[PDB]
Amino acid sequence: ASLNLPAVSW
Amino acid sequence: DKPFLSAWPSAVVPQGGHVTLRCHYRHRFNNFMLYKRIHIPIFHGRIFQESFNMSPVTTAHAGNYTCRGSHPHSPTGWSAASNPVVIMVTGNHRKPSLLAHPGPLVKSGERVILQCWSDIMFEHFFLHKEGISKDPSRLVGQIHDGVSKANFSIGPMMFALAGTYRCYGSVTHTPYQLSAPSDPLDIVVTGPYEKPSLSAQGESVTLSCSSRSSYDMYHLSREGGAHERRLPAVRKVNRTFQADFPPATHGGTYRCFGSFRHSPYEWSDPSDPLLVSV
Amino acid sequence: MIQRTPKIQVYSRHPAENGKSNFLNCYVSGFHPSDIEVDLLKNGERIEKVEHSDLSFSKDWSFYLLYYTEFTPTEKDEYACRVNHVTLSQPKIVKWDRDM
Amino acid sequence: GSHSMRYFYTAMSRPGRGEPRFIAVGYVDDTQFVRFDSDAASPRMAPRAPWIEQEGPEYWDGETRNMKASAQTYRENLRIALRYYNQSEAGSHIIQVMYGCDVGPDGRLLRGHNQYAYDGKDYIALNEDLSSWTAADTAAQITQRKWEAARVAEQLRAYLEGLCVEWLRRYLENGKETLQRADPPKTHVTHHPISDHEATLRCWALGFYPAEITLTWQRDGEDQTQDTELVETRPAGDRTFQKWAAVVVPSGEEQRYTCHVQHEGLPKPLTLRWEP
Ligand SMILES: *[C@@H]1O[C@H](CO)[C@@H](O)[C@H](O)[C@H]1NC(C)=O
Ligand SMILES: *[C@@H]1O[C@H](CO)[C@@H](O)[C@H](O)[C@H]1NC(C)=O
Ligand SMILES: *[C@@H]1O[C@H](CO)[C@@H](O)[C@H](O)[C@H]1NC(C)=O
* CATH topology agreement for domains B4-90 and B97-190: yes
Give the whole-angstrom CA distance, residue C78 versus residue D124.
47
DSSP state of B251: P
Give the whole-angstrom CA distance, residue B149 versus residue D219.
85
Decide: residue D64, CB within 10 A, 0-12 exposed, 13-18 middle, 19+ buried. middle
Between the alpha carbon of residue D187 and those of residues C12, D183, D202, D208, D246, the distances in Å are 16, 12, 10, 10, 13
**CATH architecture, range D182-272:** Sandwich (2.60)
CB D251 within 8 A of CB D241: no
Q: What is the dihedral of CA B258, B261, B265, B271, to 10 degrees?
A: 0
Between chains, do D151 and B24 touch, taking CB under 8 Å as contact? no
Give the whole-angstrom CA distance, residue D141 versus residue D168.
32
Give the whole-angstrom CA distance, residue B223 versus residue B141.
32
Q: What is the dihedral of CA C57, C58, C59, C61, to 10 degrees?
A: -50
Q: Which residue, among C71, C93, C73, C75, has the nearest Cα to C83 in the 3D structure?
A: C93
Going from the Cα of B147 to the center of ligand 2, the distance in angstroms, rounded, reads 12
Give the whole-angstrom CA distance, residue C99 versus residue D190.
8
Domain range annotation of chain B: 4-90, 97-190, 197-276
Between chains, do A8 and B263 touch, taking CB under 8 Å as contact? no
Task: Please name the residues in contact with B212: beta carbons below 8 A apart, sequence gap of 6 or more.
Answer: B239, B240, B241
B176 CB within 8 Å of a chain D CB? no
Signed CA dihedral, D122, D127, D133, D135: sign only: negative
CB B90 within 8 A of CB B58: no
Decide: residue D43, CB within 10 A, 0-12 exposed, 13-18 middle, 19+ buried. middle
C-alpha D69, offset from chain centre: 23
Chains C and A contact (Cβ–Cβ under 8 Å for 3 or more pairs) = no
Class of domain D1-181 as given by CATH: alpha beta
Domain B97-190, classified CATH 2.60.40.10, yes or no: yes
Method: X-ray
CB D105 within 8 A of CB D157: no
Decide: residue B212, CB within 10 A, 0-12 exposed, 13-18 middle, 19+ buried. middle
D131-152 per-residue burial string, b: 16 or more CB within 10 A, e: under 16: eebebbeebbebbbbbbbbbbb
Nearest-CA distance C97 → chain D (Å): 12
CB B124 within 8 A of CB B140: yes
C-alpha C27, offset from chain centre: 5
Domain range annotation of chain D: 1-181, 182-272
Task: Please name the residues in contact with D238: beta carbons below 8 A apart, sequence gap of 6 or more.
Answer: C13
Q: Which residue, among B256, B114, B109, has the nearest Cα to B191 in the 3D structure?
A: B109
Peptide bond preceding D210: is omega within 30 degrees of 0, i.e. cis? yes
> CATH homologous superfamily for B197-276?
Immunoglobulins (2.60.40.10)
DSSP string, chain D: --EEEEEEEEEEE-TTTSS-EEEEEEEETTEEEEEEETTSSS-S-EE-SGGGGGS-HHHHHHHHHHHHHHHHHHHHHHHHHHHHTT--TTS-EEEEEEEEEEE-TTS-EEEEEEEEEETTEEEEEE-TTSS-EEESSHHHHHHHHHHHHTTHHHHHHHHHHTHHHHHHHHHHHHTHHHHSS-BPPEEEEEEEESSSSEEEEEEEEEEEBSS--EEEEEETTEE-TTTEEEPPPEE-SSS-EEEEEEEEEETT-GGGEEEEEE-TT-SS-EEE----
Between chains, do B159 and A9 touch, taking CB under 8 Å as contact? yes
Domain C1-100, classified CATH 2.40.30.60, yes or no: no
Give the whole-angstrom CA distance, residue B93 versus residue B123.
15
Give the whole-angstrom CA distance, residue B33 versus residue D42.
29
Cβ count within 10 A of residue D46: 17
Residue C57's H or E segment, with its range, is: strand C56-57
C-alpha D17, offset from chain centre: 28
Residue B117's H or E segment, with its range, is: strand B112-118
Resolution of the PDB structure in angstroms: 1.8
Size of interface A-D (CB pairs under 8 A): 54
**CATH number assigned to the domain covering B4-90:** 2.60.40.10
